[PDB]
Structures are given as C-alpha cells and as structure tokens.
From a paper:
For comparison, we found that the DH522 lineage antibodies bound natively glycosylated and glycan-deleted CH505 TF gp120 Envs equally well, but did not neutralize HIV-1 pseudoviruses bearing these Envs nor bound free N-glycans.
Numbering used by the authors:
A (entry chain H): 1 to 35, 35A, 36 to 52, 52A, 53 to 82, 82A, 82B, 82C, ...
B (entry chain L): 3 to 6, 8 to 27, 27A, 27B, 27C, 28 to 95, 95A, 96 to 106, ...
Write the structure that this text describes.
Amino acid sequence: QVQLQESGPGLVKPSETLSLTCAVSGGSISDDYYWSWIRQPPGKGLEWIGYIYGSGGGTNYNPSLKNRVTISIDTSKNQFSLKLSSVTAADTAVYYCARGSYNIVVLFGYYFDYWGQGVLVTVSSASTKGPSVFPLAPSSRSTSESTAALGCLVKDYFPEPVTVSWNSGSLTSGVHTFPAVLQSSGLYSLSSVVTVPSSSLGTQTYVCNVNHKPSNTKVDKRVEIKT
Amino acid sequence: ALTQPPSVSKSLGQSVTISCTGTSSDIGGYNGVSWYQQHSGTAPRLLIYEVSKRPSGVSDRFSGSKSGNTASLTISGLQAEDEADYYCGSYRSGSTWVFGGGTRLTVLGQPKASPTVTLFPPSSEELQANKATLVCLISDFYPGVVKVAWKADGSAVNAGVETTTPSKQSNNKYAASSYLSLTSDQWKSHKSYSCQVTHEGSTVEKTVAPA
Ligand SMILES: [Cl-]
C-alpha cells in the first residue's frame, strides 16, 4: 500500500536552507501524480508550497515562496524533496508531503489522498541539546489495587521531538507518554509513565527507551525502587 | 483564500455544517473541492473529494455539497471523536492550490471526569546535580481545564512552575502535566511539597517528601 515517509533535519539556522525528503513506497514516483509539499506554521492553517509532476518533472510553487522554493525528484530512491532557502522564524512549521491525485484537471482539479507523517522544522540559532533521563521510581498510591506507576523524566532537550518506548516496545499496555513542557530556558521536558503489576516489581526489569533523533541520542534508563 | 468560520460548536448527536467560501476560479470553477480532518499532532486526513465523494473507510456521517462559490461539509451524529480542525481545499485556475483557513469543531455534552493525579519526587541522580524536579502528571479529566497550585510546607510556591495546556488522550479525556523546578537545597529544606489540582470546584492534593 502507498506510504509517504518524510525525513530531514528538524533544526535549521536562520538564513540557511531547509531540506526535506519524502520517500514513496507502494507506487512509482514516475507516475501521474502531483507530488506536493504543504506546511503548517504553529497555530495556523495549512499552506500550499508547491508540487512537482511525476511524469515530466514540471513544477509550480506558491508565489509567496516561488523565490525560495525548489522541489525535485530522485527516481532512484523513489523520492521527492523540498529545499527552502534563506529561512527565517516565519518558516518554522510542520511540513507535509502529499500525493495529488487527479482524473481530469480542467473539470475536477485534484486532491491529496496520501500524506506524509509531517516533520516539525524549527528555525532557530539555538544549538541541539540531548536530554538527561531520570527514573521515576514506582508509586502505588494513585493506581488500581495490585498495580504501581513508574516512569522516566526526559529533561532539557532541544529541539522537539522525543519518543519513548518501554522494554524495547515489548511493553505497551498502560503506557502514557505526556506532551512536552517548554521551559523559559528554551529547552523541553516530558515524562512517560507506565502502570505495572505490583507483583512484578523487583523481578521484572523496566527500562524506558528514550529517542532524541535530533541529537542522535538514545537513552535506555532502568527504573527501580529507591534506596 | 478560501474562507471558513474559525470555529463551530454543537452537542453530541447533533449535525453541524461547515462552510467554505471561495471564488469562481476554484470552488465555482471546478467540481474539485476536497475536505480534510486534522487531529492535533497528526497529518490531515482526506474526508471528501470532488465536492461530495467519500473515500472508502470514511464514515457516511461525512457529506459534502456546494452552491455557487461556497462549499459545505456536513457531519451528522456528532461524537467526541469528531473534534478536530477541518479544512477545505481546491485547485485554482493557473495551476495552483488553495486551502481554507480551517474550522475548529467543539463537540459539547460530553461527561465530566475528575483528574487522576500522580506526583513523583526527584530522583537520587538529579539531586546529585544539585537540581530537583517534581513531576505532577494529571490525567483522565473532562473538560480540558485544570488549575494547579504548588505548595511547600503548605505555603504557596509561585517561582519555578511550568504547566502544560491540556491535550486529548486516545480515550477523549484530557491530560496535562506540571513541573516544579527546584535546587536540591530547596528540596531538602522543606518537610514536604504538594501538587494541588483543582477541576470543577474539587481539588486533589498529592504530597511528596525528601524522606
Ligand atoms: Cl502518585
């Protein structure tokens, strides 16, 4: 099945160039589609950036950005890409790739049936910082009988995002990862908690797997009772 | 661009119609308007294309129409799950594309729910770095509004607090968190700290101590 998968740096310095790529699977980039980019500045609406046409490579861009935008295809790799030059804080947004599908353009136009997952790009002169991860030792009082809550605190990272799993993704039931808080320092923090059987404590190991791709850092933090 | 109302609000089980006013060069130039649903933090999802067509897997509760240069999305039998931003969009003459500004849908009438409050003390290791973060995790409440007050030995703490805006959980209730950032010296100089969460006139207070 058709899938669009986005990748690219989530941190760009002002006046530098933003680059993203959209890897297509389940179909050919050479087919009759308008391979498109769309963005969404924080708390604002969707904004069209432009497209490249799969069968010929013709492009068209939003005139608000036509000066700064380049959209390209790499037929090997089955991908298309976005380059946005001379960025400013106004370009901070979630960027989406999407497939524009059509029948007869002059009668019905086209529409976006498949979408990439979206990549947040932050335009900032602040530098990348990896998180410090701290265990939150089990606490039984706020959970059901025979269970306890334990977690890990992911402190002081930049930029977003961080993802958390437990026991390498083998533990999924009862997991709750909370949205990040933004500190006055400009750094983010979040917490992830999981509710586990009180019986299992001491015998079963619990490890939170914290991934911060923007700093190419992963931390696997074991969580145990305090001593 | 394409003009949508910033918000609409209706109650559970009701219908709602969202308008999208464009021009004869887009909505009125083609049978080509499409509609997208976007939940916070996820990609837009196609609901309607070619004015009124639904992709397979989209609920028949969604329908679309147009009259002149205005398109309309109607959602029947409103559920909590339908709360989202809704966008219209269309091809426009001259080989371009335009989105509407988006409409945020609020669905009222959902049941009240009190928050669960989970409060963790600082870890040994953070303390060795002369820092102490108290973590107050607030979950399963509705509506998505809470007030958090931190206390040290019962007296109000105002400095060093950061509290998130509530966000929907998969079960359509809300979650938020509050952090109190202290020094280790501050942590060790009080008998206790408390996170007090107030919601709909009721308060849950949890306490932790250096022990
Ligand atoms: Cl607790």
